[PDB]
């Protein structure tokens, strides 16, 4: 599908987003999510570094991946007991408010790095099973090694995975958002399917509980036949094909999943380059190579072929002289106004984004394109 041209090219944006990636790795092991963006220099997220390490391992880099496998589980172990504080809390009938939640933003050494009061998200634990277990069984590793801070991160999601929180984008604490639901879904089958965690005490809820994920999405989380941004909702959101690929509430050839991408596309996708929502008014709603990716991930896994390159390619088309791929570009706005209030506050876009570089990993990986 792609000539010498192209394909020279693909190779130097995977080699170079291996670089940009392990270069700025934290000496702790901790992924950061854009090094040279004020709004994000020094902090780490799960669902980026999960993302970032999920493409990392694709490439073969098994040190760097387990350096942040290390990092998140002992960041997870140190928060063994105010989990535990949490669960006796709900036991007592005193449910814990969003302020007492576990973190969003981490510092590089392992404390809050923002206020969960104001950015409450349940998502990220839900996504670092899901990446801990699939390079696992990518390479080959004894699970024990991370299992402690496995443990902390099933019991959280087990007791507050049907909670309102923040989605992704760190908007609307109300309701409750398919692709957080199908984050926390597809870590929980990962290690409710996983043999090496068979005798957890914890096995089979999981599954039970993924179960249950399952029947809300099915009962408020579809309409039309396709996904919907949060339960409840009619709109689509860009981080919907998630719920198929990676994380499986439905096959890639399920009519949902079909339908699901077809809304993104019709609603989102400009030229390729994809929107996270239609109401998005951050940096005037730009299209995200992240969302690019993924939508292209999905497009590959269904057998759309022509499709996922097509998306690999505006992904190509968006990294800049020194092959930097930014978070999102403005090509296409959805409410072009926002965008100069956002650039005066927080700076120009940030670039590089790790993120747009993991998830750019996993798509040239799925299309058979690493060097």
Known sequence: GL?????????????????????????????????????????????????????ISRYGDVASAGRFHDWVDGVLRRRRGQVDDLLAAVDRGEVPSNEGMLPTRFTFDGNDGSDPWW???????????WSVVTHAARHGLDLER???GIDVAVDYLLAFWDRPCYDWWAEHVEHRHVSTLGAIHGGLVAVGTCAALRSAPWSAATLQVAARIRSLVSAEGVVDGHLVKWLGSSAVDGSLPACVVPFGLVP?????????????AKDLDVDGGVHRFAAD??????????????????????????GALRHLRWIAD????????????????????????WVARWGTVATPLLWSHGMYLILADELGLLP
């Open 119 to 129: 950015d409450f998200q349940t998502d990220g634990y839900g996504m670092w099973l």
């Open 318 to 341: 968006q990294a800049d002289a020194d092959g930097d791929l930014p978070e999102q570009v403005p090509h296409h706005l959805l409410h072009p106004g926002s965008r100069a209030e």
């Open 146 to 148: 991370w299992r402690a």
């Open 281 to 306: 008014v951050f940096y005037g709603g730009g299209q995200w190579i992240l969302l690019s990716a993924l939508l292209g991930w999905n497009l590959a896994a269904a057998g759309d072929t022509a």
């Open 3 to 55: 000539d010498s041209h192209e394909l020279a090219r693909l190779h130097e944006l995977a080699r170079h987003s291996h670089a940009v990636i392990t270069r700025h790795q934290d000496a702790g092991g901790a992924y950061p999510a854009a090094p040279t963006f004020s709004a994000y220099r020094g902090y780490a997220w799960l669902r980026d570094g999960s993302f970032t390490a999920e493409g």
């Open 252 to 264: 890639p050839d399920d009519d949902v999943a079909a339908m699901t991408r077809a809304a993104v």
